[PDB]
Design a protein around this nucleic acid. Structure first.
Ligand code: CL
Ligand code: CL
Ligand code: MG
Ligand code: MG
Ligand code: MG
Ligand code: MG
Ligand code: MG
Ligand code: MG
Ligand code: MG
Ligand code: MG
Ligand code: MG
Ligand code: NA
Ligand code: NA
Ligand code: NA
Ligand code: NA
Ligand code: NA
Ligand code: NA
Lengths: 95, 154, 140, 156, 186
RNA sequence: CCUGUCAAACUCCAAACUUACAGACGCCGUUUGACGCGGGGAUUCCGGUGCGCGGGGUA
RNA sequence: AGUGCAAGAGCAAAAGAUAGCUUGACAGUGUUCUUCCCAACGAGGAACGCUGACGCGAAAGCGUGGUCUAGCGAACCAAUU
RNA sequence: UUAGGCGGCCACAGCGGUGGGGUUGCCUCCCGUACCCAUCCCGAACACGGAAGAUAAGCCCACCAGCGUUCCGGGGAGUACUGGAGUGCGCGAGCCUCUGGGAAACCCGGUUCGCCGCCACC
């Protein structure tokens, strides 16, 4: 990479297809998850806040408590254990 | 149920391909195993497709090979009708054979080694550089095709 | 059907596009209510570089305030045709514009469930000439 | 310089003029020859088909086209036929003209990428195939071996 | 509409019915919403909760079914709004609802407006709602005094036939009084 | 309207494939203790080749 | 279109424009991610909390500077609270 | 749902167009400014108060496919590309066979002129 910022090489993953453009529905930003639930991490291009480092896009962790309205999701990066601070706007229930 | 025979060595073969063979209980060239026809097993054999010979054997052939190259989970003991009867649910090799083919049981379930350590093919096989459709010995075989190979390696 | 299809005057905008005013005074008397400043956009050579800047005034008259005005404005104008809107409007003159439309216009001007007026329910240049011409004067 | 230096399609496509400057103009004079006033209303249609994917410098395109059309004057300056070269040299080519240090070359020309089996030239003629000859001379000045193909023409 | 790349707003935004930016902020509280809506002739008040396939209305009141309790006056006024608020607030309590936030939709936060009257009503019904007292009308106006005085400048009845000639903010009290004890559907 | 062409820094489309988690089979582990945790001791940080995919370069 | 500045991305009853008001560019202390994928490593950065004090708003709420990714500096010594 | 309110999915719902609907009841347009409130100017809007009139807008109902969109049949196409294998071919670029996957454009014919949830209601 010519640079090493968080958004390096994120053109694709953080851009919306033209039709999904614009403010997103509020329903999924308010969704509530319970500790132990599996959730898929995927940033919503349209939603600025509550984000995590683009490298985790595609991870499926385990909700384990929350911080403020933001959730704390445990994932495993390669072989390392990590906790991600992320809002409902960027999570989905597995299955 | 298909008869699997490794015909190509481990040197230079993808690791994830080698492990697969290992999961299918084959750890040496000419070693053969019997595998159910399921989605899960199908994927496995297709991945291994280029270093093996496989196909559905005839009742007879299986019996020949079972009698000739089957073994107990441990020990020399010959697996003959008596052994089969005094150790398995069946009464004789034929009964076992039928059960394997109809995928009702497995070599392990009957206290037998998952592996039929075959002998080199008497007369030599068709080559390990081309599949069957091309005159070689790799890939899926005919029941008549598998039988010939198994029989030559009895 | 009719009655709710027949034209009516909705606001008459009288504005003096000056280039930098004292003019408000006359607009207040010619109409009868306070004028509004006219800021301009973009910086330009007519020494009009100032973005926010008084450069004229306007007055939007509604109801009687609009008629009572046109009852003298119109007479001071002759023109008609070609000089009419595709929506049944027309500007003459110091400018004096007359916005015309039919009864259910609030539908497009309110906040809740607003909507645009269907082309059919719109006012045509012709249907406009009729209404006005039918009110103290002549067309073309 | 030799065709050997650029005839292969092994480099990435390099055509974004928004990121490339100093590209040399094309030597290709025209793409439509003959009676371009008329439309393909001819009995016979022959085409020159490239038999291998290659790159063809605007150099070769011009020499190939000229040698074919210049000859199509076996029919006259205002003869009844239309000639078309459907490819355009989009691909920008470089040359590293320091040794292998900072070697990204400088723009030196353009080439058109043709895939084997595409027709680079199409001519329209009445039963009067002098055009078949105009192409024996054309594929003479382009890298690949070529196939002279006739389409509407069961008048053999 | 125009092409594959064209962006069509959400249905409720095309209809110009739902302000989604406000909606989200409203849903942040995690509390039920006290939906305060109006009509030329009526005033509605609902207590909505969030659901899997859409909102769930647990308790509601319409200025129309106000008569069902003795209302003999118009229903698109201040006193009407308050009571419909109180009525929905009571049914709300009955449903086990204790708190909510005021959603006024696309209406404006004008002081003493009917939506705030609706909010006052629901609050007095027992519902706990984040509010601000000095944005509410001064009680008298809620009673309908502003209208009684307006009929004082009579010469012609403010009400075409209807009930009374000089109107009754008293009729208002009688009703609030009624709603504050027993009765069906409450 | 017709007609002739393109894109490593284009995309209305769109694979094979790679990848997160889960279940199933397999294989493995529970006297051969896996997975994992803590600590001792290193060597190593000139690499090369084939094949596939590359970027540069006439090569 | 605009949004201070690269490039790519976000944004329309707004993240843009106007008007008004305001100083949260606040003090304190953390959680996490990043810096350094995996996988140890500082300064810096960011996200998300809490405690305290405030601003605005009817309120939910928003404000831990500018929509996001650049704009940064150890020990020793000085000056300052 | 003989017209309503709050939504979910966020064009299968967009764009454009046709027909139908209100006798007491609902939504509107509509009528009107003493009040709460309001326009850097206008009761236009916002806000408040109200029924003389109307179904012409909107809205609800029924329908049309010309455009845009979604999905499907047949064709393109098992083509393009591709994960695994080869002492197959080719001067080479590159191609081929076996095995496991498999597209896009476009044409022709269907589909689509929203679906669903909660509440309220001759
Ligand atoms: Cl993170
Ligand atoms: Cl409303
Ligand atoms: Mg990319
Ligand atoms: Mg043994
Ligand atoms: Mg021999
Ligand atoms: Mg051989
Ligand atoms: Mg990859
Ligand atoms: Mg910010
Ligand atoms: Mg020093
Ligand atoms: Mg100092
Ligand atoms: Mg009608
Ligand atoms: Na969005
Ligand atoms: Na040098
Ligand atoms: Na040649
Ligand atoms: Na740090
Ligand atoms: Na001013
Ligand atoms: Na109507």
């Amino acid at each position: 990479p010519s640079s090493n910022g968080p958004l390096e090489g994120t053109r694709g993953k953080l851009k919306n297809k033209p039709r999904d453009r614009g403010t997103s529905p509020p329903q999924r930003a308010v969704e509530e998850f319970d500790d132990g639930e599996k959730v898929h991490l995927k940033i919503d291009p349209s939603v600025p806040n509550g984000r995590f480092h683009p490298r985790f896009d595609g991870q499926t962790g385990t909700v384990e408590g929350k911080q403020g309205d933001a959730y704390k999701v445990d994932i495993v990066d390669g072989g390392k254990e990590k906790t991600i601070i992320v809002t409902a706007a960027h999570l989905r229930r597995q299955e | 149920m298909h008869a699997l025979v490794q015909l190509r060595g481990e040197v230079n073969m993808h690791t994830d391909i080698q492990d697969t063979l290992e999961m299918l209980n084959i750890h040496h060239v000419n070693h053969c195993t019997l595998v159910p026809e399921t989605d899960a097993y199908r994927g496995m054999v297709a991945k291994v497709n280029d270093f093996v010979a496989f196909g559905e054997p005839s009742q007879e052939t299986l019996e020949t090979v079972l009698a000739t190259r089957a073994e107990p989970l441990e020990g020399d003991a010959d697996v003959d009708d008596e052994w089969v009867a005094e150790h398995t649910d069946y009464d004789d090799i034929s009964g076992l054979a039928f059960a394997l083919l109809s995928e009702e049981t497995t070599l392990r379930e009957q206290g037998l080694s998952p592996t039929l350590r075959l002998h080199p093919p008497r007369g030599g096989h068709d080559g390990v550089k081309h599949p069957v459709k091309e005159g070689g010995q790799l890939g899926k075989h005919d029941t008549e095709g598998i039988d010939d190979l198994l029989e030559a390696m009895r | 059907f009719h009655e709710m299809r027949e034209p009516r005057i909705e606001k008459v905008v009288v504005h003096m596009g000056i280039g930098h005013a004292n003019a408000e005074d006359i607009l207040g008397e010619i109409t009868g209510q306070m004028p509004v400043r006219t800021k301009a956009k973009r910086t330009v050579g007519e020494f009009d570089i100032r973005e926010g800047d008084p450069i004229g005034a306007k007055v939007t008259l509604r109801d009687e305030m609009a008629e009572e005005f046109l009852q003298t404005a119109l007479p001071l104008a002759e023109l008609a045709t070609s000089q009419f809107d595709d929506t049944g409007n027309f500007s003459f003159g110091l400018d004096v514009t007359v916005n015309l439309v039919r009864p259910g216009y609030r539908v497009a001007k309110r906040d809740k469930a607003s909507r645009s007026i269907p082309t059919k329910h719109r006012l045509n240049p012709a249907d406009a000439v009729a209404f006005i011409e039918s009110t103290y004067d002549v067309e073309v | 310089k030799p065709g050997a230096m650029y005839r292969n399609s092994s480099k990435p496509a390099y055509t974004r003029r928004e990121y490339i400057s100093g590209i040399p103009g094309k030597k290709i004079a025209q793409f439509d020859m003959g009676n371009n006033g008329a439309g393909p209303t001819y009995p016979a249609q022959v085409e020159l088909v490239v038999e291998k994917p290659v790159q063809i410098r605007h150099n070769a395109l011009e020499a190939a086209r000229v040698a074919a059309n210049r000859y199509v004057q076996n029919s006259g300056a205002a003869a009844n036929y239309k000639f078309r070269i459907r490819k355009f040299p989009f691909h920008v080519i470089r040359e590293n003209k320091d040794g292998m240090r900072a070697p990204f070359g400088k723009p030196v020309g353009t080439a058109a990428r043709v895939h084997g089996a595409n027709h680079i030239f199409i001519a329209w003629v009445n039963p009067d195939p002098n055009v078949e000859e105009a192409w024996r001379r054309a594929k003479m000045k382009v890298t690949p071996t070529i196939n002279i193909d006739s389409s509407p023409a069961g008048n053999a | 509409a125009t092409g594959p790349r064209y962006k069509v707003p959400m249905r409720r935004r095309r209809e110009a019915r739902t302000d989604y930016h406000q909606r989200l902020r409203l849903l942040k509280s995690g509390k039920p919403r006290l939906v305060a809506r109006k009509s030329n002739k009526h005033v509605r008040a609902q207590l909505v909760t969030l659901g899997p396939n859409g909102d769930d209305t647990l308790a509601s009141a319409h200025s129309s079914d106000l008569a069902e309790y003795g209302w003999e006056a118009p229903t698109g006024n201040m006193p009407s709004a308050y009571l419909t608020g109180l009525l929905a607030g009571l049914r709300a309590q009955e449903a086990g609802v204790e708190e909510a936030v005021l959603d006024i939709g696309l209406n404006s936060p004008t002081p003493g407006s009917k939506v705030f009257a609706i909010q006052e009503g629901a609050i007095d019904a027992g519902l706990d709602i984040p509010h601000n007292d000095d944005v509410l009308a001064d009680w008298q106006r809620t009673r309908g005094a502003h209208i009684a005085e307006y009929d004082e400048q009579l010469e012609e009845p403010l009400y075409s036939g209807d009930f009374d000639a000089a109107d009754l903010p008293e009729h208002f009290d009688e009703l609030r009084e009624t709603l504050l004890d027993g009765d069906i559907e409450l």
